Design a protein around this ligand. Structure first.
Ligand SMILES: *[C@@H]1O[C@H](CO)[C@@H](O[C@@H]2O[C@H](CO)[C@@H](O[C@@H]3O[C@H](CO)[C@@H](O)[C@H](O[C@H]4O[C@H](CO)[C@@H](O)[C@H](O)[C@@H]4O)[C@@H]3O[C@@H]3OC[C@@H](O)[C@H](O)[C@H]3O)[C@H](O)[C@H]2NC(C)=O)[C@H](O[C@@H]2O[C@@H](C)[C@@H](O)[C@@H](O)[C@@H]2O)[C@H]1NC(C)=O
Ligand SMILES: *[C@@H]1O[C@H](CO)[C@@H](O[C@@H]2O[C@H](CO)[C@@H](O[C@@H]3O[C@H](CO)[C@@H](O)[C@H](O)[C@@H]3O)[C@H](O)[C@H]2NC(C)=O)[C@H](O[C@@H]2O[C@@H](C)[C@@H](O)[C@@H](O)[C@@H]2O)[C@H]1NC(C)=O
Ligand SMILES: *[C@@H]1O[C@H](CO)[C@@H](O[C@@H]2O[C@H](CO)[C@@H](O[C@@H]3O[C@H](CO)[C@@H](O)[C@H](O)[C@@H]3O)[C@H](O)[C@H]2NC(C)=O)[C@H](O[C@@H]2O[C@@H](C)[C@@H](O)[C@@H](O)[C@@H]2O)[C@H]1NC(C)=O
Ligand SMILES: CC(=O)N[C@@H]1[C@@H](O)[C@@H](O)[C@@H](CO)O[C@H]1O
Ligand SMILES: CC(=O)N[C@@H]1[C@@H](O)[C@@H](O)[C@@H](CO)O[C@H]1O
Ligand SMILES: CC(=O)N[C@@H]1[C@@H](O)[C@@H](O)[C@@H](CO)O[C@H]1O
Ligand SMILES: CC(=O)N[C@@H]1[C@@H](O)[C@@H](O)[C@@H](CO)O[C@H]1O
Ligand SMILES: [Ca+2]
Ligand SMILES: [Ca+2]
Ligand SMILES: [Ca+2]
Ligand SMILES: [Ca+2]
Ligand SMILES: [Mn+2]
Ligand SMILES: [Mn+2]
Ligand SMILES: [Mn+2]
Ligand SMILES: [Mn+2]
Lengths: 238, 238, 238, 238
């Protein structure tokens, strides 16, 4: 049996147990600021990610066991103009050596918009901009090896309000669940889908966040994570 | 700081740390069987509840702090005839000396269908039968001092399938959230509402389940809880 | 799998999830005051206990599995005259319906000084007074069904200083371990012994504290518990 | 608030969340084998270490808080000849970039036997061989910036038996406590001392194990870790 967990109720600057990639900083107020902010305003064509430093053991090929995990986080997206919000934020699992990919609507996760098993990405996206591959309206998606989501639901962005997310994986039913709640307006969202982690991901992964502002100057938003817990449990064989 | 927690991944017979009320038994397969089953079939006019034996400290009048809590459970409802399903199951918080009330659509929680502050009940209901006070269709509700829910959502009962529920209370936003997922069909439901526990409940409560089969012989279903975790945290002041 | 846990970093007055027995009160400073205090001084012939309200499932006769547990607590003993300190404090496990027994050197645990399997008591004692059955000097003991300890070590009472205790049970080796640390003086104590909980205790027990002041007016001390955590885990069968 | 934790009830081969240094391997039976073994006999002049991959945030200079932590582990030392046992095992905290130092009685921790504040090492040692700086007999020591322990106790090595260790740090009293229990013989050991982590260590550290076999062919032993849990909690400011 192997477990990993961590809790950040706020972030400290220069976090040596986080791998910050692209534009990501920790602010002095303790937020994980994924996309760049200049003179109080979001900057376009910005891409940031943040990963927990230690690899997570999510499945074992010797014993053929798969881990459960649950993560929670709070985030804020602030678009100066809501109709021109872009591009979004995602929580993801990826190979240990993962590096930022294309900015914009590919969210730093993929180098193109195709399906490809060699990506080894599972992600939950909070997608604020309609690209050619997206359904109509802002949405939450479960993504496996592609920016084109396996399943989506409608989600109305509440601008500059705190969103509380929980994402969990139940290995016995191969089910990934993702929920978002806005306590300020009592609005909530949920979806789940079958995802087989053993087929998709390597035995060890890194986990974290990615976000991207839009590729034109008028399509911008901030993406701040305020807090983050993670728990995984790789059980004994059964 | 005060915390309480417990986990049952299955139930043992004669559980001395559970207060079983009404018809409740533990089966040999380790399920908490809330309504009576005779010759493989559910019995009508059955009422059962089950509560954790220790009172939970959910708020402190000395320090004026309120607890957070999160509970998870799995349940199954099996109606021999789905169109004649009744009456439902609920998770609730109530005063320590709580006793079963009226059977049927009052779910063992209330002695009538009125709003009354002296009930001191907060509950999440999984309501399989439309009474005069209910909205159309089977539904999930948040209930405060009344069988008439403060807020509801549509919920399609998946007969004899395992439902995974999580209910949580965030004291800083006074928000109660309830989710239900069916991993078998990848279907999921969520709602949340403002509930002020300090106004509604006494400082110590008991927590648990209640269920009721219908009051006519043809309107019946089973109500089994398979597993239950509970966690509460009453923080230090300020 | 069944787990129970709780944490009190301090105690609130009228604690409804604790069974207070004998003289026990909660002070305004949030201490669990086991033996009586009058005009700033300890009172003789005083006996107090305190138990967590919910029974603990420590072993299951169906599956023949036994729980692990760990408990921690901080206590203070203040003897006005150290040479006349009596009688002591103990942490114990006992049947659910347990009631206080004889005061004095029997510590509220036993009705006599003999060995008897029908007691169903396992205890760790912090013994400040030499009775006929005791070794020389103040000591810590592991006690099974008798005030005459199965094993003891020397322990020097540090008067009015905070003692941090941890007691744990490892079921696979049948080993009970007890440690005491005084952080003020950097002094520490440990012992362990084989105890088979399945032979000694019923399936469900209550856990908590007992203490007794001496049976003459000049042989007195206070016994205050400042904080208490408990964790038990009854695993799935092998 | 920041917490880190992990649990290994056994080890898997090629553990990507452990930084293995020197001779360390994971066996097929799931042991962390710190010093080299050639066909079930220990090899001399062997040095191995193992660290959790993620840095631990043990204190924060912004908020002036210091973390508590607790770690537990099980180890086995098997000396073919007990009288010629060498050199030992240690649990330690060190700067993130820490590298193995001198083999033998310096245990892979230090490059010499002097006191030096630029080491930034806190360690608990299980020392099986008497060097010039050591007290008489095999012993457990608390070490701050030097192989010459700040405090020691006598410890009798029980050859090829499982030792259960717990080490904890209480920030409010600046107290480091270390215990060892042999459940097989019911023997146990404990010590504690004042250590101010803020003065000694950087804000982020790595934690783990080191071990060394002796520098002559007849002074050898194995050093296997069977299991390891770690928990740290860097609290919010008052
Ligand atoms: C482990 O604990 C067991 C109880 O948990 C012990 O068994 C019990 O032992 C008592 C004697 O102590 C038994 O009770 C007695 O029954 C006889 C015969 O009917 C009575 O003569 C006797 O009453 C007289 O003695 C009392 C003092 O002992 C006086 O107070 C009383 O006034 C009489 O003069 C006594 O009966 C009890 O009297 C008080 C009433 O409140 C009570 O209802 C009444 O029972 C008792 O029956 C027995 N219990 C059980 C369930 O068996 C056990 O003691 C050992 O075994 C017993 C049977 C005796 O042989 C003991 O000599 C022996 O020690 C004890 N074991 C040890 C090693 O301590
Ligand atoms: C699905 O994903 C795989 C793995 O990422 C893609 O194959 C890889 O494509 C890279 C190019 O983007 C290859 O590396 C290149 O090597 C050449 C020299 O040989 C260099 O000049 C160049 O700068 C790159 O480093 C990489 O080697 C290749 N790996 C394999 C196993 O083929 C794959 O890309 C698609 O197939 C490959 C073979 C190429 O034909 C690509 O053009 C093509 O996009 C991905 N498949 C799809 C359909 O996207
Ligand atoms: C809200 O719920 C409370 C608590 O259940 C109701 O108050 C209770 O009303 C009962 C009457 O139905 C009282 O019982 C009676 O006691 C008297 C004297 O002891 C007997 O003569 C008689 O035979 C009954 O058995 C009960 O004592 C009372 N309890 C309390 C704590 O007040 C309450 O009912 C409302 O207020 C009460 C005081 C009456 O005025 C009712 O008429 C009135 O409905 C409920 N409130 C509402 C608006 O429904
Ligand atoms: C393929 C791609 O990244 N498309 C981006 C879109 O995601 C969004 O950022 C938009 C804002 O103007 O510009 C497009 O270039
Ligand atoms: C108030 C009440 O219980 N009404 C019951 C309803 O809940 C259900 O049991 C049904 C089944 O026939 O009978 C109704 O008249
Ligand atoms: C058997 C018994 O309780 N003996 C007590 C002893 O514990 C202690 O209190 C002492 C002090 O004066 O008095 C004795 O009566
Ligand atoms: C400084 C040093 O490492 N001394 C080592 C001692 O630790 C032990 O290994 C011994 C083997 O018999 O050889 C000594 O030289
Ligand atoms: Ca998009
Ligand atoms: Ca109804
Ligand atoms: Ca005594
Ligand atoms: Ca040495
Ligand atoms: Mn999308
Ligand atoms: Mn309803
Ligand atoms: Mn004694
Ligand atoms: Mn030494």
């Amino acid at each position: 049996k192997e477990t990993t967990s961590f809790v950040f109720t706020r972030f400290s600057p220069d976090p040596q147990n986080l791998l910050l990639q692209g534009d990501t900083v920790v602010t002095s107020s303790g937020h994980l600021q994924l996309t760049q902010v200049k003179d109080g305003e979001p900057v376009y064509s910005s891409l940031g990610r943040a990963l927990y430093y230690a690899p997570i053991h999510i499945w074992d090929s010797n014993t053929d066991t798969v881990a459960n995990f649950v993560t929670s986080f709070s985030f804020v997206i602030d678009a100066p103009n809501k109709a021109k919000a872009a591009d979004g934020l995602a929580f993801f699992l990826a190979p240990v050596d993962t590096e930022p990919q294309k900015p914009g609507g590919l969210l730093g996760l993929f180098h193109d918009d195709r399906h490809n098993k060699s990506n080894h990405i599972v992600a939950v996206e909070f997608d604020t901009f309609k690209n050619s591959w997206d359904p109509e309206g802002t949405h939450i998606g479960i993504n496996v090896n592609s920016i084109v989501s396996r399943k989506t639901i409608s989600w109305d962005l509440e601008n500059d309000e705190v969103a509380n997310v929980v994402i969990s994986y139940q290995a016995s039913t191969k089910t990934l669940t993702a929920s978002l709640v806005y306590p300020s307006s009592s609005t909530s969202y949920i979806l789940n889908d079958v995802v087989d982690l053993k087929q998709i991901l390597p035995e060890y992964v890194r986990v974290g966040f990615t976000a991207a502002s839009g590729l034109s100057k008028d399509h911008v938003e901030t993406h701040d994570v305020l807090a983050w817990t993670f728990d995984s449990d790789l059980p004994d064989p059964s």
